[PDB]
Design a protein around this ligand. Structure first.
Ligand SMILES: Nc1ncnc2c1ncn2[C@@H]1O[C@H](COP(=O)(O)OP(=O)(O)OP(=O)(O)O)[C@@H](O)[C@H]1O
Lengths: 107, 107
C-alpha cells in the first residue's frame, strides 16, 4: 500500500534468452492489462515519434486497477553505438522521468 | 458556521461559492426521495428539512473543485507518506524555512 509502483531489471550476456523469461513472468502475473512495448514496431521513427508512442502506451495503462508493462532491449530503444558514443538524449530523459510518475491514486 | 467555510474555501470565485450552496441543498431533498421502482416524495418528513455541516463537508470533498492555484490533489501526491520526526535535522530545516518566509514577508 505504501509502494504502488515497483520496477525491476533483467540483465545478462547476449543470446541468454531473457525476453522470453520476462514474457513468461508477465503472462503468469494474471493481471487484467498486459502490454509489450518493443522496438520492432517503430522502425525508422524520429525520436519525437518514439516519445509520443511510449507516452500513449503508458497512458493506456493508467485506466485499470492492475497493470504490467515490459520494456524490451533498452539499448536498441536509445539508438546506442560504441563509437563516439552516440545516442538519443530526448528518449533517455523521457524514460528517466517516466520511471517515477505514480499513477492516479488507488491503482 | 460561516467563518469555517470562508476560511477553508480558498481560490474560490463567486460562481463556485453559489454552486457549493446549491449542491449542499440538494443532498437533503435527495435524502427524502426514494427512487427504486417509482419516484415517491415522502411528505411525512418533508416538514423537517434541515441542512447540516456534514452535507457541506461532503459537497466540498466530492462535487465542487476550483479551477485555479494548487489544491489538495497535489499535496496528496507529493507528500505521499507524510513527515516523521526521526531526528534533529528535520526541525532545523523547518526552522530555517520559517525564518526565510518571515524575512520575505517583512523586509
Ligand atoms: N529455458 C529457456 N529460457 C529461455 N528461453 C528459452 C528456454 N528454452 C528455450 N528457450 C527459447 O530460446 C529463445 C530465447 O531467445 P530470446 O529472444 O529470448 O533471447 P534474447 O536474449 O532476447 O536475445 P538477444 O539477447 O540476442 O536479443 C526463445 O525461442 C525461447 O523460447
Amino acid at each position: 500500500d505504501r509502494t504502488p509502483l515497483v520496477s525491476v531489471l533483467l540483465e545478462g550476456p547476449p543470446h541468454s534468452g531473457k525476453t522470453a523469461l520476462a514474457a513468461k513472468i508477465a503472462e503468469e502475473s494474471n493481471f487484467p492489462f498486459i502490454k509489450i512495448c518493443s522496438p520492432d514496431k517503430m522502425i525508422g521513427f524520429s525520436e519525437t515519434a518514439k516519445c509520443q508512442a511510449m507516452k500513449k502506451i503508458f497512458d493506456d495503462a493508467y485506466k485499470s486497477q492492475l497493470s504490467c508493462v515490459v520494456v524490451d532491449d533498452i539499448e536498441r530503444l536509445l539508438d546506442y553505438v560504441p563509437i563516439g558514443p552516440r545516442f538519443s538524449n530526448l528518449v533517455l530523459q523521457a524514460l528517466l522521468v517516466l520511471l517515477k510518475k505514480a499513477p492516479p491514486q488507488g491503482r | 458556521d460561516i467563518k469555517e467555510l470562508a476560511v477553508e474555501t480558498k481560490n474560490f470565485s463567486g460562481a463556485e461559492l453559489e454552486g457549493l450552496v446549491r449542491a449542499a441543498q440538494s443532498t437533503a431533498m435527495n435524502r427524502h426521495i426514494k427512487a427504486s421502482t417509482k419516484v415517491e416524495v415522502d411528505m411525512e418528513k418533508a416538514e423537517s428539512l434541515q441542512v447540516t455541516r456534514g452535507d457541506f463537508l461532503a459537497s466540498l470533498e466530492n462535487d465542487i473543485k476550483p479551477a485555479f492555484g494548487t489544491n489538495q490533489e497535489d499535496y496528496a501526491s507529493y507528500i505521499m507518506n507524510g513527515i516523521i520526526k526521526w531526528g534533529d535535522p528535520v526541525t532545523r530545516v523547518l526552522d530555517d524555512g520559517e525564518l526565510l518566509v518571515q524575512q520575505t514577508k517583512n523586509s
